């Protein structure tokens, strides 16, 4: 979820990963990507 993607150093996000994060699970009910 939101505080364990954050608290993990990863970002809860809506569409592709960034450069040097990858998907990691999920935040906000689900819809966006923990990208880490």
Same mark, same amino acid.
């Given at each position: 979820?939101? =505080?364990?993607?954050?608290?993990? @150093? @990863?970002?809860?996000? =809506?569409?592709?990963?960034? %450069?040097? *994060?990858? %998907?990691? @699970? *999920?935040? =906000?009910? @689900?819809?966006?990507?923990?990208?880490?």
């Amino acid at each position: 979820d939101h =505080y364990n993607c954050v608290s993990s @150093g @990863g970002a809860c996000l =809506y569409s592709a990963c960034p %450069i040097f *994060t990858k %998907i990691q @699970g *999920t935040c =906000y009910r @689900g819809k966006a990507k923990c990208c880490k």
